[model samples]
Target: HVDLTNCDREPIHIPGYIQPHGCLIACDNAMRMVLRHSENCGELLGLEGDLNGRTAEDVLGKRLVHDLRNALTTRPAMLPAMETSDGRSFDISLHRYKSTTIIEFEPSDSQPLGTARKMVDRIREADSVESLISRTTRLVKATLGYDRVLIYRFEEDGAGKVVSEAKQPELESFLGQYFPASDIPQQARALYLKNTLRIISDASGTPIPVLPAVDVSGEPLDLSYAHLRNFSPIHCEYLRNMGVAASMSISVIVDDALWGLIVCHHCSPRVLSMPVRIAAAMFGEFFSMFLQVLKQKRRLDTINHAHAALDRFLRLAAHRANLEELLVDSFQDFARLIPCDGVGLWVGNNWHGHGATPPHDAIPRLARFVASVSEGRVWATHALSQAIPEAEIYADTAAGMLAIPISQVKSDYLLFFRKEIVQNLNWAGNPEKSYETGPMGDRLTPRKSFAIWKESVRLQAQPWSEADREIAETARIALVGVAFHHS
Candidate 1:
């Protein structure tokens, strides 16, 4: 068990531990004198003991440090692979965040070109976004030999769900399961966009602490881009809670924003070569571009639909005798422009209704709520009762309400209603239970058990889409034009 309150405060960026597969060192320019080095540098580089003040020339020889300095200056973000004096091949990742430069030396292996070619072709041939991600997850799982691979998409509210998955037959399916926003704190999310790829090779392995905790500036080292950056202990406990021994994730960015992630999980501890992880990251980049294309096309279709529907309404309004009659007659068509289960019109003390709605007696209260909003504007809410307490009785029939005031002089208005859509969320763990005491103090931690939690939701409808909001505004403008002409 772990605490839930202190999760945001966790120093994930400076976890002070490097993965067993690699060694980390931070130094100034020219690789002169180590500012910080992994405790296990003895095992990886055959150099040990109070390495903070020792120059790389002494530990790794003058030639290797000279070449490293050149690589750092040339690439800076990512250093090319170079062999150490100890005969071990390593890929160095460079980051100059502050006053010091941090270098990560991870075991490097040859990129599997044959597998990369096949995945690229399959990803290119995918006809739909779903198919593309589905194929991507499969490719990632097969390439990394991970037990499970999932395409996890982040929702607007910060919650995430596994949209697609490729997993071994023996593993429990996590597909379609939702995880709470708190599972990934704001700091962790910020880091994801900065460092696109991350691998936790072994969950149970001991963390190798940096030799001197504080850097030359007497501040914690920023390991934002280090490949072997230490894992947050709380996050490590999160994986332990999930029964995952190893995991890897690549950020799926779309239009320069953090869109989602391609997450891979393994039941047993596993180490992937740097080349394999790089291939996975490359695929993520391509997938993000593909998603951007699909989203742009969808946005275009929505705009076209809105325009076509609004055009018809304007034409119909041209022929009607009065604004009230026009709205009553075109009520159904007007409702179609937006997604609503029912539609209603309040004009000159009369009410004309369509589809599902609250009882006629409830109209006065509903009208009062609409009156509270500013004139000549549209207002909407998925939970009607939350906004209008009188709407509590009609929660089932009128859970969502969108209204636009077409006229202030005659008090004419249009109301769109959506019935309650009961939903059963499959959360990976009960998000409601987010706290437990730990050794240090009360800290935020991931839920231990992943069981389906059933909730009875009321007074809420399907949230309105951007297209629906746009159409509502269009209808309001058109209605105002007709009302003014009649006035």
Candidate 2:
């Protein structure tokens, strides 16, 4: 799942570096033996001696070691797991790196905003997805001092759209603007899948290398869980292009999948202390919880609506005991059940068509094509004419067709058709022209400006969702039951 074109793996988590704001030390789990330490450890921790092959108890003292041991757990160590030394306060975090454990240290002094729990009630009060997103953007904007706070949700196409925003009045908005998948690529998305929070304190800053780079396997120390890890050179340029000196990306993972990002942008070099960043991370997770619930609620409502249509259609069918009368009588319930433009019922070699379907003669030709080409299965196509040349005449009305084969041996069938639609995808800039060679020696420069680019997609209806197909089958089974009851 590497993007060689975008240099996803070719870039550097392999660089073996962390931001200069913090120092790192790795120790073996057995006897808490010290394995490696950063070059800056002498300046921060006063441990100038070579740290190799020494127990944590011998080097870091028994008191601090005892305090750290208590914080070690299976949970991903994201929050400040701190301890004091020489009367200078440091926020400590511990992460396991296979056989060794990495302990990071950063300064404890930062502007305190301790109401992450207090803001939870505002977002929790949201009943819908839009409200949840609005509340989240507002919470981040009001809590953190970022100039622009926005939510970008990844769509089916792998691109992201700014679904919500809370920005300074002076700045132009990107709400509903689309960014290409190339911006995120593949392997980087994998990193966001595993890690919840990322911070770029200074986009133009140099990252310090881990002293004596690479572990036993000869790979750079993996920063998969390192909160203080620095951005790649290419990533730094991308940020600089947008005039951003600092940024933070908090993941909104839904069902273990990297759903999207709650991104923050600052006009100048700004570093939120470890504790404040922790609050942003926790607030994002809280928003994610509400996002999942609201999504499922909407899905269930759509499903319930379909079921209600099914019940009404079934009642009308049972009352008439005649298929033609039933279809003609319960037209609203029948055509709307699967959300298609029109419906066609093929029975006794005749066409019973309704809603926006083609002429009566056209229906017989459509069914004959389905019978011949899609011989023995439920068939669906977004572009019917592309699959069947004869369908060109009915392509606009039947651009998308979902065939419910009622009987393989008999000629009875149920058909749903969707008319062609124009869907506009407005991007911030031409994604094809997204990259340009800059003065910085590399060819990858990103998003220097914002201009609306619209792509009007045609020759297809809104493609059916998986849930659309699911409920279609349920309706088909109920219809077959009605057919049996009448016989």
Candidate 3:
């Protein structure tokens, strides 16, 4: 619904286009318009018009009316077209989209000049995450002839999921799949988060010296943080297991949050040239911007939902004076904020006696396990043996976990349940499948064929991650930290 009128000058710049016709336009929904070309041809078209929020018909009708009509029925792609209007006919291009359109038509005769202009014009179109990742994957894999190109979003739990991907024909599904958070555990994720980006050219080659010697014992040295810490050895092991010999990864930052990574992997050792890496980095930066907008929008939505849930619970608990009523409301609302199986709040003076609740009952019952770990210590455990009790563990419902003494001043104890202990609310129609129905355990047991709960539990592993710490902090800052007994 944006009214983008063109300038009245003879050499009018395309409305809103910082550069000339080598440009792009975006609509209200962030849908974009850019004139893509197989090769450069945008210098001679004399592109000057108000194209914002306009269609090809509206923008090109004056120049090439019939061709405009034909292009409208066809996909608004950057297909090659000819212009025989003047004595010197040449090739031209047109692109159209939902709310905006870009027109960059250069004479075929202008060789380098035209191509250079087209390249400049192309910059305007590079604005969205999908577009950036799509182009980057093609450019990377096609240039390197790699096996796979993936965008992995590291969850706050140190688990990662492949959100966007492109792979060779022989490869199976590699996109939109989840990977274990521990594949790049908290420490590893932290390294990548701090380094900005890391590229492992060839697995077989000796490690490159990104940073030299540094003191780990808290002593100052001439070296940067940890040089060899570029890609975690464990993650390298993971890449090797996946049959990847060479990988290039660029870190994506969504706002101040180090979001995830865009990686290109090859079956054989490979190295991207400097130019390609820079281009990919540019695309990554663009993607970060695009994702940041989406993230902000999504974060706002979550904030709104949390506000509503808190309001509803407070109103519901206003009349109930019993601690049980308050606990029920808290339990119900806590699940809305986090992925948990069940929630148990022990607010009485004697919480140690009633520690046999649903979530806590699974704590191991062995003397050796209890003796190995100190009491009142919060740890991340993935499994249960007869030897452990009150293990702060990763469960099916929970990719990460915590069991902190909720307060230094209160006597309340809260036991949070993950996968097996509690069930996440199934949404009828929700993204993240919050309500969408799917295989019972397609998540945890990524290899599970039957979707059984037991298999899902088996898929998890030991320990929490730095990403988990972030989620915990976020929970503490946003929601009241679960109150737990200290001693």
Candidate 4:
């Protein structure tokens, strides 16, 4: 009986259980003695019941333990397609928690990641963020067979937006739909970062509990890094509500944070071949590298353009005496800092305007709002009339404002402008539907959120990029680098 309040506090990472498809074993890292094993270790490892004083070397072999320890010292990776002593092969996963080394043996149908090279080549060949994202969805769909594949990007407020997808005919498109942040709780987000990849082969499958349940600490085992760890019961139920039989998500990280997720879903149990699992995990790491490179290029490109325009303007004006009036004429150069239609320069109570600026009289009113709040730095707004009711008279001409205070003592504010645009936002479902029934008949579900919900915004300009502040700061820094000094 978990509602939103208690659901957030759910101890999901220490389930002390796992999906029935894999075998789990934990050994004390110092003493190297077997601490706990899942019930299936008997069937999978050919050793029944308790480990009975088994050392890591006795069951896991000396080579396997040595490699895992060495891998952990610097970095770590999955032990792929390793054969066990009983002649059965498995994909081995190893990690650490506290003083124990957690190992998992998942049955594998080992095969080549045939498309890995081509997929990575296409990823590197991407020239634009849009092209990169479009290619990502298509390749994920081709490589991982599922009814729906979505690149779910996280919003500034922690909500998720389905930026793009490649879906089979059976599934409705969730592209451009928003799912609120509360849907995936904070603890779950932290866990996603740690694991990087997760697969729920059967949402409705029973979870196999660990033999002893608790560790020497008398607490449930911390399965934070367990590959086969049983997912939250509430989440499994949430998936069931969405009519999803199986699902997988690979974390998409960028800017040193959880930027989004690559979520795929369908209606049946799926034991993906070992190659496919590696391919999915491989793409995520490489994709983050690709994304980071693309963003750097964008930032550099913006700064490069600003330099070109400013250089030309300065070249054309330096020989002349009236450079003060050129502030209006050079609005063309300043506007290059961002995509805006016009600019306004307030110089010690005198106003110089060009492009699609508001009337000279009205800019002072806007300046008052900027000066009171900006604290002598870069400040911006995509909506003018909403910030202050006075700007409604001419918001159609300049609904957006970007202000940069040039001096702390003088009212020299450099401002940019963009026109109003009506924004229609689509949500995954009604924002009010945060309640649902779980296994015990009570829980929360955003799973029912496949229904399309809509919201329309008015009196706003195109939203600024997350890099806008950085871009503005670079331009201001150039004032030190490129500004002409007199006296």
| Candidate 3 residue-wise lDDT, 7-58, digit = tens | 1111211111121112222222222222221111223433444333354334
Clashing pairs in 2: none
Candidate 2 RMSD computed on C-alpha atoms after optimal superposition onto the true structure: 4.6
Clashing pairs in 1: 3-443, 3-444, 4-443, 4-444, 5-444
| Candidate 4 residue lDDT tens string, 1-487 | 5555587788888877899888898878763788888988888778765883688878877866676667663123577778765677788777777766788888866643566666788789899878998888888878778877888877665767788888776555567676666668899999888767788888888888886897667877778878788887777777776678888898988878998898888877876755677777777888988988897898888778767765676576666565556665665567766777788778667788778888888877877788898886788888787788878878778878888775545566788888775333444434443454655453334444333111222466656676667667666554423334410
Separately for all candidates shown, the number of backbone clashes (residues 3 or more apart, or on different chains) is 5, 0, 14, 0
Which candidate would rank higher by TM-score, 1 or 3?
1
- In candidate 4, where is summed lDDT lowest over 10 consecutive residues? 448-457
For residue 209, model 1's alpha carbon misses the true position, in angstroms, by 1.2
- Residue 373 displacement in candidate 4 (angstroms): 4.6
Cα distance off (Å), candidate 3, residue 72 = 49
TM-score of each: 0.85, 0.80, 0.41, 0.79
Q: How accurate is candidate 3 locally (lDDT)?
A: 0.43
* Tens-digit lDDT track of model 2 for 175-245: 76756565675867877877777788887776777766866767566667777776766667766666778
What lDDT score is found at residue 7 in candidate 2? 61
**Candidate 4 accuracy as TM-score:** 0.79
Task: Quantify all predictions' global Cα lDDT against the true fold.
Answer: 0.74, 0.71, 0.43, 0.73
